[PDB]
Amino acid sequence: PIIDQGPLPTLTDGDKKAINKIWPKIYKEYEQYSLNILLRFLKCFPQAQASFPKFSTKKSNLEQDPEVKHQAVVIFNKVNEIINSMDNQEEIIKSLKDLSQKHKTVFKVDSIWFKELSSIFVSTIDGGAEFEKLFSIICILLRSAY
Ligand code: HEM
Numbered sequence: 001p002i003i004d005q006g007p008l009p010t011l012t013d014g015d016k017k018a019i020n021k022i023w024p025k026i027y028k029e030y031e032q033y034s035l036n037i038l039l040r041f042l043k044c045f046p047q048a049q050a051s052f053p054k055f056s057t058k059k060s061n062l063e064q065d066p067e068v069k070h071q072a073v074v075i076f077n078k079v080n081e082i083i084n085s086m087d088n089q090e091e092i093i094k095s096l097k098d099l100s101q102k103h104k105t106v107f108k109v110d111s112i113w114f115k116e117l118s119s120i121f122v123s124t125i126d127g128g129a130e131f132e133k134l135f136s137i138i139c140i141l142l143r144s145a146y
Contacts, residue, residue, distance in 0.1 A: 002122065002132050004115045004139035008093075011133065016086050018130040023083055026125050027076075031069075034076035037124045039063055041117045048116070051109050079121070082138060096141035104145040111143045 003009075011019075026033055042049050042062060049056060054067045062068055078099070085091045103109040118135040125131070 003136040009133050015130045034072040037121050038072035041120050100142045100145035111146045114139045114142045
């Protein structure tokens with residue numbers, strides 16, 4: 001499944017091929033997708049809500065929260081940008097290695113959260129083993145500054 005520790009996995013030509021088949025259908029509605037992913041994460045993991053100073057209101061207005069939607073799309077886009085550069089595995093490493101640093105020293109986020117949001121991301125878009133490896137690479141790197 002999704003992993004967040006250990007030797008970085010390598011994306012096969014096959015994995016990359018499969019991912020690029022499912023992806024467009026997803027970003028064809030990145031707004032309705034990015035939202036459900038973030039909303040299901042906060043509903044099933046309410047304790048994670050305290051990590052976003054940008055918001056901490058009553059969950060009754062959490063789907064209209066403009067800032068909620070803004071963070072939703074921010075995540076979806078990074079994932080998109082990582083898929084756009086799957087071939088150059090040196091670029092991905094450099095990029096996500098630095099983002100891990102922001103989350104640690106700047107946003108003061110707990111590393112145990114990435115895998116969980118990642119689990120919901122995949123399930124919502126229905127990605128297979130391919131996407132689990134992608135997010136395995138994503139989560140391992142996001143926890144590298146820790
Ligand atoms: C799939 C994994 C994730 C990706 C791809 C991702 C990506 C990003 C990106 C692109 C930013 C923008 C940073 C900047 O502008 O310099 C960000 C900020 C942030 N992320 Fe994540 N993130 C992920 C998971 C999480 C999780 C699980 C949490 C914690 C519950 C988290 C908490 C934050 C916070 C609090 C900020 C600061 C937002 C702000 O104040 O504007 N992230 N993230």
